[PDB]
UniProtKB/Swiss-Prot annotation, chain B:
Top-level taxon of the source organism: Eukaryota
Name of the protein in its database record: Nucleolar complex protein 14
Annotated spans, Disordered: 28-42
Natural source organism: Saccharomyces cerevisiae (strain ATCC 204508 / S288c)
Biased composition (Basic and acidic residues): 30-42
Subunit structure: Interacts with snoRNA U3. Interacts with EMG1, MPP10 and NOC4. Component of the ribosomal small subunit (SSU) processome composed of at least 40 protein subunits and snoRNA U3.
Similarity comment text for this entry: Belongs to the NOP14 family.
Positions spanned in the full protein: 761 to 808 of 810
Function: Involved in nucleolar processing of pre-18S ribosomal RNA. Has a role in the nuclear export of 40S pre-ribosomal subunit to the cytoplasm.
Location(s) in or outside the cell: Nucleus, Nucleolus
Gene that encodes it: NOP14
Swiss-Prot record, chain C:
Domain of life according to the entry: Eukaryota
Membrane-spanning parts: none
Subcellular compartments: Nucleus, Nucleolus
Identification of the protein by name: U3 small nucleolar RNA-associated protein 12
Subunit-level organization: Interacts with snoRNA U3. Interacts with MPP10. Component of the ribosomal small subunit (SSU) processome composed of at least 40 protein subunits and snoRNA U3.
Species of provenance: Saccharomyces cerevisiae (strain ATCC 204508 / S288c) (Baker's yeast)
Full protein: residues contained: 406 to 687 of 943
Stated family: Belongs to the WD repeat WDR3/UTP12 family.
Curated annotation (Swiss-Prot), chain D:
Taxonomic superkingdom: Eukaryota
Full-protein positions shown: 549 to 593 of 593
Location of the protein in the cell: Nucleus, Nucleolus
Subunit structure: Component of a heterotrimeric complex containing IMP3, IMP4 and MPP10. Interacts with snoRNA U3. Component of the ribosomal small subunit (SSU) processome composed of at least 40 protein subunits and snoRNA U3. Interacts with the SSU processome subunits EMG1, IMP3, IMP4, KRR1, NOC4/UTP19, NOP1, RPS4A, RPS4B, RPS6A, RPS6B, RPS7A, RPS7B, RPS9A, RPS9B, RPS14A, RPS14B, UTP1-UTP18, UTP20-UTP22 and UTP25.
Stretch list, region Disordered: 16-41
Functional summary from the UniProt entry: Involved in nucleolar processing of pre-18S ribosomal RNA. Required for the early cleavages at sites A0, A1 and A2 during 18S ribosomal pre-RNA processing.
Organism expressing this protein natively: Saccharomyces cerevisiae (strain ATCC 204508 / S288c)
Membrane spanning residue stretches: none
Family, similarity comment: Belongs to the MPP10 family.
Protein name per Swiss-Prot or TrEMBL: U3 small nucleolar RNA-associated protein MPP10
Curated annotation (Swiss-Prot), chain H:
Shown part of the complete sequence: 19 to 159 of 318
Function as written in the Swiss-Prot or TrEMBL entry: Specifically dimethylates two adjacent adenosines in the loop of a conserved hairpin near the 3'-end of 18S rRNA in the 40S particle.
Subcellular location: Cytoplasm; Nucleus, Nucleolus
Full protein name: Dimethyladenosine transferase
Organism expressing this protein natively: Saccharomyces cerevisiae (strain ATCC 204508 / S288c) (Baker's yeast)
Gene encoding the protein: DIM1
Binding site for S-adenosyl-L-methionine: 15, 17, 42, 63, 91, 106
Protein family: Belongs to the class I-like SAM-binding methyltransferase superfamily. rRNA adenine N(6)-methyltransferase family.
């Protein structure tokens, strides 16, 4: 399922699109997971050591 | 009433012109948020 | 009404104006009623905790080592199950009643002595007064830092919490009564109500209006919204030490160093 | 003009003088200087 | 006739994209089934803002308020003041103007009034340190947002001045096919009408999460007091991850409500930024729409931008579909040759847009 | 059309307020421009 | 004449005299300052009608292609 | 009298720079935060002590010649920064200094080198100190 095709098939909804190969921009802040879940996911700072110097 | 507005307008444009020319004759021959710190205290 | 004094506690009925029972006690600094008025609980300067039963006419149990230093202030939850002690040892101790006897549950260390302890009627928040002139407010349930109040010249002697619980009043030896919003900890306005220090300040129940008593012997009737004094009342020659408000709020009792206790009744 | 200065040091409150011993005193010549009991008592 | 859109979705962008393209558009069925149908007050205010910076535009709002026909004019700009309704902060109105400032006849000097922060919109520092750096990368040398007053909710009272001195024909073609290396973390912890202790407490929380990193950490303490602190007490924190090697930035931001612990907000916002990096390849999500639009309006040349798989979401899909409807431009994605990560390269041809309003 | 001469001013409240502030400020400092005995 | 009345008005509101007298909130004082200032200006004792022109210039002070036409009811 | 005592302690019997640009640079290098507090020495006219009053929470100034200090007071009397400013009489070496986050001052050259080691010795010393010294020294 090449996404490049799926994006321009207007018949397929974006939520339908995202699942197959795997709300509104007026909200500038993007979607995030719950705080406690995010806190656990990073009790270490591994998985990003490459990005930082 | 309209006379006074014109004098004010003519004064403004003249001042703006001379300020611009002072710049041109200057050119021919850092922090953009510094004033925020002063405004902090009030 | 219970009157705590050095070497003597007495409980007087408003109608009689006379003592029903008298109890031997120490140099009590803080006096409180347990729910229903059955028992009276006091804190001595030595730091021993005194609990009297009014019906028994005698003390139920004393915990000499409950607190090492002087019990500066004492306050209770609305249910009365939980008791909080603010004192000179710079540690706040929470006590739970179990069948009636007192048992320590936990102690919270603080950098400074707790001059005054106040718990909100909803029991969501708890307030601490410190000699550092900083008022620390904790959630009562979670026991965690919430917000701070600063700027008082001298330590706040009294803290009171409104019925709506969004409002905190802090009276200090700075001789200015300040009005602090709980939601963000902002001061809406500051009043220099009394020339001398305001020992105790209380909210009129179910009203944002608050009473203030000071060493200058004045009792003032102040509205928070207006931020001005409604009325000024002088009856005591010497400094009024403390002020207590009835649950209805109809009448407020005040006691002074002149050994005269007077009821101010609303007409 | 020294006396006018000297009176100026007297008027303001936020002024302090050091002697030859190192002590911290006010202009008048007196050593410049809460208690939990006193504030609650 | 008119390119037709449905609903209030992407309202600002569709108006902006129409303005840049010059193609008239129609937006219909705006909240048709709602009890209060049609445009909201802040959307109407946004349309008034569009007029103040353009000339010759025709904006038609239906008798029911559920349909808008927009025939864009030329971007002319000038100096003016805009009063933002309390329903939205200034960032709601500053953000779309960023898409238009480099392409105007006259410099925008727009003075915005109203609330300056919210949970749902770009804050000041998000504009100042989070999107404004991106415009600089695309060719906007001179551009600034000056806070003359901070206004926290609900009473607001803030003041911000947008000045974009740089007028350019079009943004430079983008060529970024690497993951920028973060050199340091910076940010601003700010508060209004409250004690400085709160700002220190957010910084304490943010530092707690981020101390484990190997890079330098320096968060500015921005306590606002006095006449200049607005009408409402409030506080918030913004953090920015900076990559000095190519001037790239990633940022997260949020403000505190009544009942919130300052340390928790610092932990969360620190716990927020570090996600945007993990979800980012060359730009974080919250500036991607600004980047995508600029390459579309670049010179007729293939610009390349690297994006992470985490960034290609429903937000990204609807954005690209909106661009194709108005500009007919398609964004192509190709795999990166590496196996360490699963990133993508977004290749976009510019349309040859030029600033024809400006003096030459 | 332009006008030859300076238009006659009007004493509006703002001018009155500005003038009165200067008068008040002068007397706060007692900065008075008055003749004195020589 | 006028100075006597102004002195009395200030004294009645306590704006003059000793503050440390042995044997009014500040906010009310500023209200008195506003009242005494507007009361003791007759030009803006009351002046005859027409001596001021203020409402004239203010009305004068109150006195682009395309736009929004809002047909919403 | 107070006046006689003041005369005894000091009899009331220094050249200063006038270019403001260097003073602005001196202020920039210190980078004093509003939270941070500064100790002032030999303030002189107070053109420098007002600058630190502008950028610092609190200022306490010690002057050698009492007259030179007194006029500094008169400059600040009845000003918003009046509360923050404090003055001191007698040399800084001689009495315990109030804790300060930065040292900015017009150090006398005679005591400049002695001044620095007092800062190094003094516990909780300033994180940064900006001073004017003789070029050779």
């Amino acid at each position: 399922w090449n996404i490049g095709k799926l994006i321009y098939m207007d018949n397929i909804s974006p939520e339908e699109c995202i699942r197959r190969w795997r709300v509104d921009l007026e909200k500038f802040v993007p979607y995030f997971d719950t705080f406690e879940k995010l806190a656990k996911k990073w009790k270490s700072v591994d998985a990003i050591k490459e990005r930082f110097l | 009433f309209e006379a006074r507005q014109r004098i004010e307008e003519k004064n403004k444009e003249s001042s703006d012109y001379h300020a611009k020319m002072a710049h041109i004759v200057n050119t021919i021959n850092k922090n953009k948020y510094e004033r925020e710190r002063k405004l902090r205290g009030g | 009404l219970a009157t705590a004094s050095n070497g003597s506690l007495k409980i007087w009925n408003i109608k009689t104006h006379k003592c029903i029972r008298t109890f031997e006690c120490g140099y009590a600094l803080t006096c409180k009623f347990l729910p229903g008025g059955l028992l009276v609980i006091l804190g001595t300067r030595n730091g021993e905790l005194q609990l009297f039963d009014l019906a028994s006419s005698s003390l139920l149990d004393t915990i000499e080592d409950a607190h090492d230093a002087a019990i500066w202030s004492l306050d209770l939850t609305s249910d009365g199950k939980r008791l909080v002690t603010g004192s000179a040892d710079k540690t706040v101790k929470f006590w739970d009643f179990k069948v009636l006897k007192l048992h320590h549950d936990t102690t919270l260390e603080l950098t400074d002595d707790i001059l005054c302890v106040r718990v909100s009627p909803d029991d969501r928040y708890l307030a601490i007064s410190l000699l550092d002139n900083t008022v620390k407010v904790f959630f009562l349930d979670s026991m965690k830092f919430y917000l701070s109040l600063y700027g008082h010249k001298l330590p706040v002697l009294s803290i009171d919490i409104s019925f709506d619980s969004k409002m905190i009043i802090t009276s200090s030896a700075d001789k200015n009564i300040k009005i602090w919003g709980l939601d963000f900890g902002d001061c809406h306005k500051s009043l220099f109500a009394h020339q001398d220090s305001i020992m105790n300040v209380k909210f009129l129940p179910q009203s944002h209006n608050f009473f203030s008593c000071s060493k200058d012997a004045v009792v003032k009737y102040w509205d928070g919204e207006k931020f001005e004094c409604i009325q000024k009342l002088y009856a005591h020659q010497s400094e009024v030490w403390a002020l207590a408000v009835a649950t209805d709020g109809g009448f407020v009792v005040s006691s002074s160093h002149d050994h005269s206790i007077r009821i101010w009744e609303e007409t | 003009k020294r006396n006018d200065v000297v009176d100026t040091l007297s008027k303001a409150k936020n002024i302090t003088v050091i002697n030859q011993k190192g002590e911290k005193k006010d202009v008048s010549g007196k050593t410049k200087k809460p208690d939990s009991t006193n504030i609650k008592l | 006739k008119y390119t037709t859109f449905q609903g209030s979705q992407n309202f600002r962008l569709r108006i902006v994209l129409a303005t840049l393209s010059g193609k008239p558009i129609k937006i219909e069925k705006i909240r048709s089934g709602d009890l209060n149908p049609g445009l909201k007050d802040y959307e109407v205010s946004f349309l008034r803002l569009i007029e103040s910076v353009t000339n010759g535009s025709v904006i038609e709002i239906s008798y029911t308020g559920t349909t808008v026909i927009y025939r864009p004019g030329i971007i002319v700009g000038g100096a003016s003041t805009h009063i933002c309704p309390s329903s939205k902060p200034v960032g709601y109105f500053v953000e779309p103007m960023l898409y238009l400032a480099p392409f105007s006849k006259k410099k925008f000097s727009i003075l915005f009034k109203g609330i300056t922060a919210s949970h749902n919109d770009a804050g000041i520092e998000a504009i100042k340190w989070g999107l404004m750096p991106v415009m600089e990368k695309f060719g906007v040398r001179e551009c600034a947002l000056h806070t003359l007053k901070r206004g926290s909710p609900p009473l607001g009272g803030g003041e911000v001045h947008l000045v974009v001195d740089s007028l350019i024909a079009q943004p430079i073609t983008m060529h970024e096919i690497d993951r920028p290396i973060i050199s340091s973390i910076t940010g601003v912890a700010y508060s209004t009408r409250v004690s400085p202790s709160l700002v220190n407490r957010m910084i304490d929380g943010a530092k707690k999460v981020l101390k484990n990193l190997q890079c330098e950490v320096n968060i500015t303490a921005d306590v606002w007091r006095g006449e200049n602190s607005g009408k409402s007490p409030g506080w918030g924190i913004t953090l920015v991850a900076q990559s000095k090697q190519k001037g790239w930035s990633y940022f997260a931001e949020d403000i505190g409500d009544a009942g919130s612990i300052p340390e928790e907000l610092g932990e969360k916002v620190a716990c927020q930024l570090l996600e945007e990096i993990s979800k980012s390849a060359a730009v974080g999500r919250n500036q991607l729409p600004l980047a995508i639009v600029y390459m579309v309006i670049g010179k007729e040349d293939i610009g390349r931008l690297r994006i992470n798989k985490e960034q290609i979401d429903e937000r990204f899909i609807i954005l690209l579909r909106d661009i194709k409807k108005i500009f007919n431009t398609e964004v192509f994605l190709k795999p990166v040759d590496e196996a360490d990560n699963e990133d993508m390269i977004a290749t976009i041809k510019g349309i040859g847009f030029t600033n024809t309003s400006k003096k030459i | 059309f332009d006008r030859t001469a300076k238009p006659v001013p009007v004493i509006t409240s703002e001018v009155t307020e500005s003038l009165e502030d200067m008068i008040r400020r002068r007397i706060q400092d007692s900065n008075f421009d008055d003749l004195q005995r020589r | 004449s006028q100075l006597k009345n102004l002195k009395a008005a200030l004294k009645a509101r306590g704006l003059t005299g000793q503050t440390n007298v042995k044997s009014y909130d500040r906010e009310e004082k500023k209200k008195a300052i506003a009242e005494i200032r507007e009361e003791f200006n007759p030009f803006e004792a009351v002046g005859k009608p027409g001596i001021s022109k203020q409402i004239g210039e203010e009305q004068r002070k109150r006195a682009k292609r395309g736009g929004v036409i809002d047909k919403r009811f | 009298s107070a006046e006689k005592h003041l005369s005894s302690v000091f009899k009331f019997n220094q050249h200063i720079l006038k270019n403001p640009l260097v003073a602005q640079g001196i202020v920039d290098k210190a980078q004093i935060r509003p939270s941070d507090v500064v100790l002032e020495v030999g303030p002189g006219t107070g053109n420098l002590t007002v600058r630190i009053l502008e950028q610092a929470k609190n200022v306490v100034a010690v002057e050698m010649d009492p007259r030179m200090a007194a006029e500094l007071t008169k400059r600040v009397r009845g000003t918003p920064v009046e509360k923050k400013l404090e003055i001191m009489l007698g040399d800084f070496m001689k009495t315990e200094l109030p804790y300060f986050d930065i040292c900015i001052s017009n150090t006398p050259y005679q005591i400049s080198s002695p001044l620095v080691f007092k800062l190094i010795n003094q516990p909780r010393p300033p994180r940064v100190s900006i001073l004017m010294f003789q070029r050779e020294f």
